[PDB]
């Protein structure tokens, strides 16, 4: 009975080790994806800020032109 | 831990307490505003005899502790919970006594006088504090925004405040509070999910679905069109994985949950939607500054963390107001903590160090006179 | 001897289970962060397209107001 | 048997199915909602090969047939039992086909969409029915009561619905369902009788003790005082004679069984008692009509057949609400069948004959569109 229990425990150990390795792999993948997404969102924040500044300048000049008209 | 004699900024916002020292850019101790009381009586020996859990200690155990909200719509229901949450924040997280530094607390606009007198009395008589100060949230949020003009929309958990400030000028007559916020949205989502088929009637599940909403629920850009296109769903419906493992499937309900804000008729109240109430408030202001209020509107509150609020506000205001002027809506990043951030930058000024209220003058004057001095 | 071996194997099993739970928690955190960042990227891409359309509208309006001036 | 082309009113209430033709004052076919399935396999020859008993045929034999409840808390568990109970009611008692007259069914408030679509599909596709209609129980009960104002408390077998209707006006936002009813009371009585000494763990005995409760169990006018005076029992304890002959002796347990309704903590649920939930519902309504809801509260459901509920409700509401106004509680005689009675008087109107849903429009529209048309 003890030998059977030891065999079962060793099987469970192997399965847990495989699960841990798979979890670590998925962890690396998810961290990579999150880092890429953070870089993309930061770049898009700078781009949207620049376009917002451009739009503010455009609307200020439009108001000035309307007043002149 | 702290080597600077500066006030402790403790934002006791409805739903989330955010406490931290002045000068910091974000609260270190962030925990929900909940109190867990032991429901049953155990014959067990050795466990903590503590009869009142709080914060993360209560969040970790929501099946055994009956959950009570220490704040409802704005009015403080139980003061024992108040004493519990401050005593906990003082002698369990910050590891500092209030007898060495001031304390700049932030309260909601248009609150009862009983609430203010009660908190001030607990902060002066019971606890030995050198000086107290009550501050409105809207001003500090406008500070953190880095402007002096605009209408702040603060949507907490059980109350929503619209506060117009033009050129750094408060308007106490136009501030209108309406008790529509995250709790009524959680209730609407709960009843519609009960309509879907998954029925629950306990508070722990209510907090779980609240978190699910915070994570997934968003605002729709066109309600009826999304309803039509979701009738035949494909990518419009999403399958969420509960932290317990039960597979939940939620489709259109998401972008119909916050819609109750725009249509209070869903909860059978004659009150107007947040956008229409803000628009009416703008008419109540003067015409001269209305354009500036259109161009400098600011948002605050955790409820504003949903994606799609800015666009919905822009379309609704454009449909209500003329489409000749320019109506830009600005939402600063991390707006939720911005209020607290303001507190920090407000506690470092020497002049503000001169506008505190010491114990002795309060004791002779009494709490009511203190109310007159502040405003 | 086999009882000692089973004890060692069970201790290793507990260690692997703890490591697997920790890895699963990290995986949850990382996947949540990645999904939030991806949703933010998509929403901000929509936003910047809307702002670019507004900028084009403003530029054309300016050109018309200029001609009228 | 029937010479009038009128809808068959079949109230499929949880615990008791009540079927009868429209125009009658009481259901002719009244049988419990249970399905008996052959547990073992017999080598015997000649007995009925029928693999699914129902109604009185199952009640007559509960020792051989494993009993399954076709409805739980409100959500339909098994649809085969549904088809069995309707097919039985159609081709074993009423002796009439559904292809000649309509059918006005009554469903519980706030039920799943799957349940409604399923029953409608079984009533249209499988069975050839000229027209169907789903109706909420509370409206028909208020009809039978002969009023238009009040809050209907319908306590069935596994669910309890509080539905406020003022001036005939439904309030779909305030209807709150709670799964506390006769089954949880039967379970509480069973566990406390197991605590007394007579232990059983089979469903037939559960139904027997359910009947014993229906016959004897009543509500207490003062729980703690009755506990004290029953400590030394004389006339407070009664000796019941089981239909089998075993002499059972039951004392205080009777008036402590329904008390679980007033103290859900006995079953370890954070939900509030029926009276406190009704009171909270009244606060959720508007103040203007609250007095009318106090003066016109109506009750429904078989569970209300216990003696002493009206007085207990009056004392509890008086203790909770002020004692300045007048709070009269009205319980119409034979309230349990009143719902069904309403159905009868609702199926005789010509206008109601114009509000039915025929097969063709449902087939083109589909079940979901039918859900939109009703509400
Ligand atoms: N990260 C988040 N995402 C979505 N909603 C949130 C988030 N944090 C808080 N909320 C919502 O905001 C409400 C609490 O806001 P509160 O903390 O009072 O804001 P503030 O502190 O700015 O006053 C709750 O109803 C909650 O649902
Ligand atoms: N004559 C009676 N006396 C006591 N309780 C009853 C009686 N008839 C039914 N009940 C209880 O009512 C419940 C079933 O009610 P139900 O038939 O659903 O009411 P309704 O038909 O009005 O919805 C069961 O739990 C049962 O114990
Ligand atoms: Mg807020
Ligand atoms: Mg009933």
Contact B311 C47 (CB under 8 A): yes
Q: Is D324 helix (H, G, I), strand (E, B) or coil?
A: coil
The CA dihedral of B31, B32, B33, B36, to the nearest 10 degrees, is -100
CB-side neighbour CA atoms (13 Å) of B326 = 17
Residue in B100, B146, B144, B127 with CA at minimum distance from that of residue B11: B144
Q: In chain C, what residues touch B310 (CB-CB under 8 Å)?
A: 47
Paired with D131 in beta bridges are: D358
What spacing in Å lies between the alpha carbon of B71 and ligand 3's midpoint? 13
Q: How many Cβ atoms from other residues are within 10 Å of residue A50's Cβ?
A: 11
Contact A9 C6 (CB under 8 A): yes
φ, ψ (nearest 5 deg) of residue B62: -110, -5
Give the number of A-C residue pairs with CB atoms closer than 8 Å.
102
Rounded CA separation D241/C29 (Å): 64
C-alpha distances in angstroms, B140 versus B107, B176, B343, D123? 11, 18, 6, 62
Q: How many Cβ atoms from other residues are within 10 Å of residue B46's Cβ?
A: 5
Q: In chain C, what residues touch A59 (CB-CB under 8 Å)?
A: 58
Output DSSP code: residue B190.
H
Contact C61 A61 (CB under 8 A): no
Burial of residue B173 (number of CB atoms within 10 Å: 0-12, 13-18, 19+): exposed
Q: Which residues contact D262 (CB under 8 A, 6 or more apart)?
A: D223, D273, D274, D275, D312, D316
Rounded CA separation B103/B44 (Å): 40
End-to-end C-alpha distance for chain A, whole angstroms: 98
Q: What is the CATH number of domain B186-274?
A: 3.90.640.10
The CA dihedral of A47, A48, A52, A58, to the nearest 10 degrees, is 60
Q: Please give the full DSSP string across D170-226, using - where no structure is assigned.
A: --TTT-EEE--SHHHHHHHHHHHHHHHT----SHHHHHHHHHHHHHH----S-HHHH
Residue in B252, B236, B306, B229 with CA at minimum distance from that of residue B274: B306
> Under a CB-based contact definition with an 8 Å cutoff, are residues D199 and D191 in contact?
no
Q: What is the CATH number of domain D139-185+275-337?
A: 3.30.420.40
Tokens of B126: 């019971």
The beta-strand segments (E) located in B15-116 are: 16-21, 29-32, 35-38, 53-54, 65-68, 71-72, 75-76, 103-107
Which is the CATH superfamily of the domain at D5-31+73-138+338-371? ATPase, nucleotide binding domain (3.30.420.40)
Paired with B19 in beta bridges are: B10, B29
Residue in D266, D267, D278 with CA at minimum distance from that of residue D314: D278
Rounded CA separation D157/D155 (Å): 7
Residue in B141, B169, B136, B121 with CA at minimum distance from that of residue B357: B121
Tokens of B281: 């408030």
What residue owns the CA closest to ligand 1's atom 6?
A: B302
Chains that touch A (3 or more CB pairs under 8 A): C
Paired with D103 in beta bridges are: D8, D132
Question: Which ligand 2 atom lies nearest to the CA of residue D15?
Answer: 14
Contact B195 D110 (CB under 8 A): yes
The structural domains of chain B, with segments of one domain joined by +, span: 5-31+73-138+338-371, 32-72, 139-185+275-337, 186-274
Contact B307 C47 (CB under 8 A): no
What spacing in Å lies between the alpha carbon of D336 and ligand 2's midpoint? 7
Tokens of D127: 């069975």
Question: Do chains A and C touch by CB distance (3+ pairs < 8 Å)?
Answer: yes
- Which of D15, D107, D144, D213 has most ligand 2 atoms within 8 Å of CB, for mutation? D15
Residue in B189, B140, B203 with CA at minimum distance from that of residue B168: B140
Residue in B154, B116, B149 with CA at minimum distance from that of residue B133: B116
Q: Which helix (H) or strand (E) holds B334?
A: none
Distance from CA of C60 to the nearest CA of A (A): 10
Q: Which helix (H) or strand (E) holds D300?
A: strand D298-300
Helix axes D113-121, D79-88, angle to 10 degrees: 40
Q: Please give the full DSSP string across D91-153, using - where no structure is assigned.
A: IIIS---TTSS-EEEEE-SS--HHHHHHHHHIIIIIS--SEEEEEEHHHHHHHHHT-S-EEEE
Q: How many Cβ atoms from other residues are within 10 Å of residue D168's Cβ?
A: 11
Helix axes B309-320, B274-284, angle to 10 degrees: 50
Output DSSP code: residue B250.
E
Rounded CA separation B165/B109 (Å): 13
> Under a CB-based contact definition with an 8 Å cutoff, are residues A44 and C40 in contact?
no
Q: In chain B, what residues touch C47 (CB-CB under 8 Å)?
A: 310-311
For B88-96, the CB contacts below 8 A with 24+ separation are B88/B54, B88/B55, B89/B10, B89/B17, B89/B19, B89/B29, B90/B127, B93/B19, B93/B28, B93/B29, B94/B1, B94/B8, B94/B19, B94/B21, B94/B29, B95/B1, B96/B1, B96/B2, B96/B8
Rounded CA separation B237/B230 (Å): 8
Residue in B256, B257, B280 with CA at minimum distance from that of residue B178: B280
Paired with B38 in beta bridges are: B65
Burial of residue B47 (number of CB atoms within 10 Å: 0-12, 13-18, 19+): exposed
Longest dimension (CA), chain A: 98
C-alpha distances in angstroms, B175 versus B136, B280, B284, C14? 12, 12, 10, 59
Question: Which ligand 2 atom lies nearest to the CA of residue D306?
Answer: 4
Q: Tell me which residue has tokens 């216990």.
A: D306
Question: Which ligand 2 atom lies nearest to the CA of residue D338?
Answer: 22
Contact C39 B215 (CB under 8 A): no
Q: In chain B, what residues touch C43 (CB-CB under 8 Å)?
A: 307-308
What spacing in Å lies between the alpha carbon of D303 and ligand 2's midpoint? 5
Q: Please give the full DSSP string across B263-319, using - where no structure is assigned.
A: -GGGGT--PPPHHHHHHHHHHHS-HHHHHHHHHS-EEESGGGGSTTHHHHHHHHHHH
Paired with B161 in beta bridges are: B154, B177
> Under a CB-based contact definition with an 8 Å cutoff, are residues B74 and B159 in contact?
yes
Burial of residue D258 (number of CB atoms within 10 Å: 0-12, 13-18, 19+): buried
CB-side neighbour CA atoms (13 Å) of C24 = 12
> Under a CB-based contact definition with an 8 Å cutoff, are residues C48 and A49 in contact?
no
> Under a CB-based contact definition with an 8 Å cutoff, are residues B324 and B294 in contact?
no
- Give residue ranges with CB within 6 A of ligand 1: B 11, 13-16, 154, 156-157, 181-182, 210, 214, 300-303, 305-306, 336, 339
Resolution to 1 decimal, in Å? Answer: 4.8
Rounded CA separation C57/D107 (Å): 56
Sheet holding D65-68, edge to edge: D53-54, D35-38, D65-68
Q: How far is CA B116 from the centre of its chain?
A: 17
- Which of D12, D16, D72, D111 has most ligand 2 atoms within 8 Å of CB, for mutation? D16
Rounded CA separation D309/D306 (Å): 7
Neighbours of ion ligand 3 (CB under 5 A): B 154, 156, 301
Output DSSP code: residue D166.
B
How do strand D16-21 and strand D29-32 relate by DSSP bridges? antiparallel
Tokens of D271: 């939900």
Q: In chain C, what residues touch B220 (CB-CB under 8 Å)?
A: none
Q: Is B72 helix (H, G, I), strand (E, B) or coil?
A: strand
What residue owns the CA closest to ligand 2's atom 6?
A: D302
How do strand B16-21 and strand B29-32 relate by DSSP bridges? antiparallel
Q: Which helix (H) or strand (E) holds B160?
A: strand B160-165
Q: Tell me which residue has tokens 């239909």.
A: D243
How do strand D65-68 and strand B65-68 relate by DSSP bridges? unpaired
Question: Do chains B and C touch by CB distance (3+ pairs < 8 Å)?
Answer: yes
> Under a CB-based contact definition with an 8 Å cutoff, are residues C48 and A51 in contact?
yes
- Give residue ranges with CB within 6 A of ligand 2: D 11, 13-16, 154, 156-157, 181-182, 210, 214, 300-303, 305-306, 336, 339
Q: Please give the full DSSP string across B136-155, using - where no structure is assigned.
A: EHHHHHHHHHT-S-EEEEEE
Q: Of the CATH numbers 2.40.37.10, 1.10.3720.10, 2.30.36.70, 3.40.50.300, which one belongs to the domain with range B32-72?
A: 2.30.36.70
What spacing in Å lies between the alpha carbon of B193 and ligand 4's midpoint? 24
Neighbours of ion ligand 4 (CB under 5 A): D 154, 156, 301
Residue in B107, B108, B122, B84 with CA at minimum distance from that of residue B9: B107
What spacing in Å lies between the alpha carbon of D159 and ligand 4's midpoint? 8
Rounded CA separation C47/B335 (Å): 18
> Under a CB-based contact definition with an 8 Å cutoff, are residues B131 and B358 in contact?
yes
Q: Please give the full DSSP string across D231-249, using - where no structure is assigned.
A: HS-SSSSEEEE-TTS-EEE
Tokens of B301: 């509150």
Contact D73 B199 (CB under 8 A): yes
Count of positions (residues) in chain B: 375
φ, ψ (nearest 5 deg) of residue D366: 95, 165
Rounded CA separation A61/A67 (Å): 10
Q: Do domains D32-72 and D186-274 have the same CATH topology?
A: no
What spacing in Å lies between the alpha carbon of B113 and ligand 1's midpoint? 25
Tokens of C35: 């999904």
How do strand D103-107 and strand D131-136 relate by DSSP bridges? parallel
Rounded CA separation B60/B204 (Å): 11
Rounded CA separation D240/D213 (Å): 11
Q: What chain B residue is nearest to D177 in terms of C-alpha separation? A: B201
The technique by which this structure was obtained is cryo-EM
Contact D174 B267 (CB under 8 A): no
How do strand D150-155 and strand D298-300 relate by DSSP bridges? parallel
């Amino acid at each position: 009975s003890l030998q059977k229990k030891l065999k079962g425990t060793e099987d469970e150990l192997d399965k847990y080790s495989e699960a841990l390795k798979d979890a670590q792999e998925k962890l690396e993948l998810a961290e990579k994806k999150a880092t890429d997404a953070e870089a993309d969102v930061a770049s898009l924040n700078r781009r949207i800020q620049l376009v917002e500044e451009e739009l503010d300048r455009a609307q200020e000049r439009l108001a000035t032109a309307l007043q002149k008209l | 831990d702290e080597d600077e004699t500066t006030a402790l900024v403790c934002d006791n916002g409805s739903g989330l307490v955010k406490a931290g020292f002045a000068g910091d850019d974000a609260p270190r101790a962030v925990f929900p505003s909940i109190v867990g009381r032991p429901r049953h009586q155990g014959v067990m020996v050795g466990m903590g005899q503590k009869d009142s859990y709080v914060g993360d200690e209560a969040q970790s155990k929501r099946g055994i502790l009956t959950l009570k909200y220490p704040i409802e719509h704005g009015i403080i229901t139980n003061w024992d919970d108040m004493e519990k949450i401050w005593h906990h924040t003082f002698y369990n997280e910050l590891r500092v006594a209030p007898e060495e530094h001031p304390t700049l607390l932030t309260e909601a606009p248009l609150n009862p006088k009983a609430n203010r007198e009660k908190m001030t009395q607990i902060m002066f008589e019971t606890f030995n504090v050198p000086a107290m100060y009550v501050a409105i949230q809207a001003v500090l949020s406008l500070y953190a925004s880095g402007r002096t003009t605009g209408i702040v929309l603060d949507s907490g958990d059980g109350v929503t405040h619209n506060v117009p400030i033009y050129e750094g000028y408060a308007l106490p007559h136009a501030i209108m509070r309406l008790d529509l916020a995250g709790r009524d949205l959680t209730d609407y989502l709960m009843k519609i999910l009960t309509e879907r088929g998954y029925s629950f009637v306990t508070t722990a599940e209510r907090e779980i679905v609240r978190d699910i909403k915070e994570k997934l629920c968003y605002v729709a850009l066109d309600f009826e069109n999304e309803m039509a296109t979701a009738a035949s769903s494909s990518s419009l419906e999403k399958s969420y994985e509960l932290p317990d493992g039960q597979v939940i499937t939620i489709g259109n309900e998401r972008f119909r949950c916050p819609e109750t804000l725009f249509q209070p008729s869903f909860i059978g109240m004659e009150s107007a939607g947040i956008h229409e109430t803000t628009y009416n408030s703008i008419m109540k202001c003067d015409i001269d500054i209305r354009k500036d209020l259109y161009a400098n509107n600011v948002m605050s509150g955790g409820t504003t963390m949903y994606p799609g609020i800015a666009d919905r506000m822009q379309k609704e205001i454009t449909a209500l107001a003329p489409s000749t002027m320019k109506i830009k809506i600005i939402a600063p990043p991390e707006r939720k903590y911005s209020v607290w951030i303001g507190g920090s930058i407000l506690a470092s000024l020497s002049t503000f160090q001169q506008m505190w209220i010491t114990k002795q003058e309060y004791d002779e004057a009494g709490p009511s006179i203190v109310h007159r001095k502040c405003f």
